[model samples]
Target chain A: LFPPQWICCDIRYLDVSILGKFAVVMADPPWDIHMELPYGTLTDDEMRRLNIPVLQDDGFLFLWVTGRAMELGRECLNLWGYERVDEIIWVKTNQLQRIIGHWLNHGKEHCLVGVKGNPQGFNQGLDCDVIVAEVRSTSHKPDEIYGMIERLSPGTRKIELFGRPHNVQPNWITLGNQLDGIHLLDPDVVARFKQRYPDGII
Target chain B: YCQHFVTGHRPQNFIRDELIRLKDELIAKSNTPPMYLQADIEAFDIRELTPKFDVILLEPPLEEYYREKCWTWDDIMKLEIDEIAAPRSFIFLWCGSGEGLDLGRVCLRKWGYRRCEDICWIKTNKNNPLDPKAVFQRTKEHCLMGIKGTVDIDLIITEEPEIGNIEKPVEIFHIIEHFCLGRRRLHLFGRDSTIRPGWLTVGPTLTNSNYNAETYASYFSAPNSYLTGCTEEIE
Candidate 1:
């Protein structure tokens, strides 16, 4: 089992190459859904220019997309050198009360799955492509997805981008601005991360 | 908040559009009236029936198995599904939130079909109390989709509150009608409330029976019949 590690910094300015590659990458990006959101949203250009391709040459990407960013999410996946393969739908519920939306009553979110190269030695048909979980705070994703991903690719190096302190897991290396502080397990990664940001500040 | 862009510029769902376009065409070509057969599927020889179905739906009584006259997974597998499903077809099996998810896939592979997409039915309770022994409040059911031949389609997500015992969301039928172009549809282990316009429903729960092999076969015997419209090119 791998120990949990996290980095607290703005992803836009961070040199992601120091983190090295991974077998699986999951991101719940704060997409510009063209609505009043609790957290700041990333522009289309900023999302497109993310250093995702540097993280993995052969791996799976699970990107959460909603509202107006659905099409843009697909486009970004292509630009990031990945093929849009499958999709996982997260049906949201709040104790039976209807959640309001712009048009129709918004009851669900979508997570697009993409693949770059031939990622081998992975399990198939272990879990279904749907997550029916309760609605939590703003932009909080379901915890069931972690189990699903781990079952698909067991004991492999995995990373979670745009994550918060709550998103940290036992085997995942989480990177986000909302995390508490920097926690690196590898000596080489710690040296490289400290060399760039000497004061431990972004 | 970002302002709304151009008035008419909206994202398009190509698959949904194509399915809506073909809905009227499918309904117009349905010469034979919709019917059902109230027979126990276990004893019935479903393979001997004529008019192979392009889409088959199975909603076994998984939840009511122990309390009522329920069909087990082994019993469900006994039915010759490959004999009823067309060469290139689709099957939607409603697997309960338990072992059904795994066992449902086994049934698909054994019945000559490849497991494809999974349609999730997120069930929301109405002021229902929680159980202490439960790990999580069970609030979801899954329908595993299997395809025989090459058929391309995407995903969907729709929500409805928990109602009647084993009733499914109506969105599933619309999804089936959109993805599969064939007009010949079948529903096994269906109840009276589950009957629809374009589908031939069969189950012991149904009240009446009007299914005739000759009449059903004649509906799809024409040269330009909708039966052969299983596979279609879509963007």
Candidate 2:
């Protein structure tokens, strides 16, 4: 069982509703560079606004980016009103590396963390700029990032926007179109939430 | 040279002829004939291979930036690199420059091989810039060495152009002959002239009967040689 606070729904559903104010937002948007998928594609400008409704005034944002779209990713982050803080490098050293790109073979992804407002300082000395891990599946983020988030911006009320099931954690709420079983709501908790707010995104 | 070997992704008949010529020459010098199996690496059934092998030579075909159709990561997903390797074996995986290292690294993981050291395949002459507008011109490729178990040895070789495009240098064959532990070897996706004492070949020309059968049968008489019609792994 997971924490009931983790929200789950399609992006369109969440766009219509603001779930809750959270202190942190981590997003891995499907940036369709060379290939297209069924998931709806959004311009980086559009992506900047996806989590704005639920983000607390003083929250932090982490945007995942690939090499092909780093420029757009940065523009999107700044446009979202978050300032550049630091980047977390995830090196695909193991099974996750692939040779699909024509010009540049990609073995790593970037997590650009930006802050909107003044929050508590992160764990100063223990932070590492690089994390080496094997990405297990397509578009799967490494589990270490959440722990890194906890260290970088210590807070309990955090959320993963554009999230996946592999990111289930006790302290954070996750929202995405494909829940993949990460979002677990107790019957009683659901009843209370339903009672509190009659309409919801399923 | 190699006790047992495998190859793929190249002209099989051309390689068979080269191997035949090399083996014949080596036999004159009192070298034992080698055995190998060369074919499209993706199609082979690993389970059908007995006793495994000490090495697998992989030289996946190269694709330029403007190619209409190209290979993708999904193409190698089913390779299962470890399935056919002995606990202690060597993997000579060919890679392009720069990002090609990324592709090689990923395949190394997906196929369950551990990284050792890199062996460069530097060309004697530089390849004309693949893209005149591009920043860098490549004069070399890479051969990343991965070990499934423990095989202690080191090798270095320089490029000597043979007869065809992207054909591997014979120096590698001589190196493998020296250090392959006299165990079975498999060459996957390689050149036509990649003959050794006891290696096998599987490749593109073998399937269509595109080459001379007499030369192929006379030279590649290894009992386990499969040119085509072998059961490909469904996955």
Candidate 3:
């Protein structure tokens, strides 16, 4: 038979049992933190699938969820055989200051922590309390957060499920926008990237 | 070895004139005259030289071949050929498989050309994977290249290659044989047979683009040999 791994197939439709063993799972589902856009939409089934078939009981999921769907987020945790643990909030620093016609500014995004079983808080001292990080970017976690994970965890066998580029750490596996500039973790780097892959030119 | 030279006759034909000039210079410097030369039959007729050509390139099934329509590597390998098989040319400044490596090889052989080598495409998208199953995969991909003469190529670069396929260095030998105008060869991209008949080529070197060469080299023992060639990349 041909090598099973070499064949091309849609990742979403494929059996999830294939991911094998993973220590940490980081996902940026197509769902936005506060609202949803027509193009960037992912159904609940697609989001929580790997948890059922691939995630190990001892693994952890740093899942991105919208503040509006906090309830839906909990439901996903339960379905994936995981329980809600803690949360990490992303506060936008240089944001347009979400002043929506005198409405309260929406400056923060949320990442609800979910554990497959009894979650082990990396003992280097994890303040179990909610983490408030005031960093700004449409699609990235701050280096500080990545730094925290590195110290607490081995940073091995990583999987970037719906992510964009950042400063690639060692041993990281990425699935979405592979370039470092498109997701633009650092605004300067984005410009450097665009010079090579121009916009509107697919 | 630089090879498969396409030629033209006038101002717009400097390609042909330049080739003629180079051919003469090569012959003058050579200890031995070249055994063969190649060109596309339809590109320009070099017919006045008798016996069809020392080697000719036959690019067929262009429409049917793109989607990998042909089955079985053996079937592709069995096409009729003369003494040698080498590539006719390389288009696309730096293109991937979609640019046509399989069809290029088929054409080179059907018309009697055999010198397997790779037209390396140094990928700019360093982050992109060349093959996914190999996990995130290797981002670099090269085209299978061969020439229309007895000579093979010198692999200017290679990796002691832990992953990926071993590369073929046949085309460069012939390119050198034709361009340098000699049959004697030297080895690069070192193989089990470094010095072989009709030509000699340089061995492969692990290029900077090849990051995991140290490990790949440890695993695959690249032995230089005499009688030449095959397909795929030797990482």
> Which of the two candidates, 2 or 3, achieves a greater TM-score against the reference?
2
| A73-173: candidate 2 lDDT, tens digit per residue | 76677676876555555545444232113212343466766777666544432334444455577778877677666665565567777777667677677
Q: Write the per-residue lDDT of candidate 2 for residues B1-235, one digit (tens) a residue.
A: 0001112111111111034444334423432244444445566675555445566777666564222323454565457768777776777777655445556767876777766554544343222113321111233455666766542122222333443356666656555554423335566653455655445444443433122324334542454233121222122
lDDT by residue (tens digit), candidate 3, B112-134: 44433333322222122121111
Which regions of candidate 3 fall more than 4 Å away from where they truly are?
A1-11, A14-16, A32-38, A48-53, A95-103, A118-121, A127-137, A177-202, B1-235
Residue A171 error, candidate 1, Å: 12
Rank all candidate structures by their DockQ, best first, as comma-separated numbers: 1, 3, 2
Q: Which numbered prediction scores highest in DockQ against the true structure?
A: 1
Instruction: Write one digit per residue (lDDT tens) for candidate 1, span B89-187.
Output: 889998765556556767988999865555656542223312211122234566777878862223233332334346777777766765645767898
* RMSD of candidate 1 to true structure, Å: 13.1
In model 3, the Cα lDDT at residue B2 comes to: 6
Worst ten-residue run, lDDT, model 2 chain B? Answer: B1-10
Share of real interface contacts recovered by each model?
0.00, 0.00, 0.00
RMSD (Å) per prediction:
13.1, 18.3, 25.3
Model 3 lDDT tens row, A159-189: 4565554535554444454443222233333
**Model 3 scores what on Cα lDDT?**
0.37
List iRMS (one decimal) for every candidate: 16.5, 19.9, 29.9
